Design a protein around this ligand. Sequence first.
Ligand SMILES: O=C1c2cc(-c3ccnc(NC4CCOCC4)n3)[nH]c2CCN1Cc1ccccc1
Length: 340
Amino acid sequence: EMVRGQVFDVGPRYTNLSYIGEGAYGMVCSAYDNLNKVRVAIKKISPFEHQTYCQRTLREIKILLRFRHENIIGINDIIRAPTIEQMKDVYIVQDLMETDLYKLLKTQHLSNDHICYFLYQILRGLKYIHSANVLHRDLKPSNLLLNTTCDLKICDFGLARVADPDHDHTGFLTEYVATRWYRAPEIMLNSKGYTKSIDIWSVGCILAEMLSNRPIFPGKHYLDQLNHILGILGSPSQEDLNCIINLKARNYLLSLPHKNKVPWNRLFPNADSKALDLLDKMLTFNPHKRIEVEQALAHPYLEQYYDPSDEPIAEAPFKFDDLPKEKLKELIFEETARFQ
Ligand SMILES: O=C1c2cc(-c3ccnc(NC4CCOCC4)n3)[nH]c2CCN1Cc1ccccc1
């Protein structure tokens, strides 16, 4: 069958296709799985015309095949031609979810009980990812899927990287890829986004969004983003400026008139007080003082859900993090053999 003028050769195991979502290099559809008797999500990927989408495809497949967690999307099946030459697209079968947090946030008011449960699930998923030495780098509401009982799952590992704190520093205003509204401020100033602290910042942004149903730092352009953050957080202290050695970055910060911190209580007067305290910790301008994932789970805001024993970590971390689209087709092919 075909969806929206796109051929969908996922037969014959899956039938009754329905459109779900779209990607730059692909399309997401719903279908009935005959061999398991339930509805599922199938993701048609055609990345072979670009070396960039291939990296993402490879990255994503390798990670998801290696991860196994309640709060992380899994791969049920991988469909593709039986030969290198015939392989035009690749179909990823996954559990069908009811919605995503992005959609939910535009239509629904979240109760405190919901915010707490969702935050806990994101943290539980995040802890497992960070324990594998992996950075997601693209956490946002659209990448968080929900089912009808409010089980949360993390998806889209295309931009994921192995953590590299040693190689993180960079110059002022260095190009980034991740979604702007969830960019930590150090990305703009001196960071490549090779630390776990970047995911924490995005999750803080997600917390604020769940609190108000609006993005907290909706910057129009790359540097605009910085101003949105500083507008709320206020001018960084001396200690935090001392952490930024690049003169271009430091001098820009010094050139800004002093900005006073806007209290969270003023921004979210209906918010739970324990929630706002955690929000403050996650949205800390200094990455080094920013709360870590395990500490966040231990915060009193989440105490009704906190159980260290029931928050697993990865068995095998990722050891290490130019290939043309050709050799990238070969690997994807090699990584997908399991399912044929
Ligand atoms: O990967 C995805 C993906 C996975 C799902 C998904 C999975 C499970 N279940 C549901 N259910 C949906 C029901 C309706 O409300 C929303 C969730 N969606 N959706 C998307 C849209 C974004 N892309 C990006 C992408 C797509 C193709 C190629 C490259 C990249």
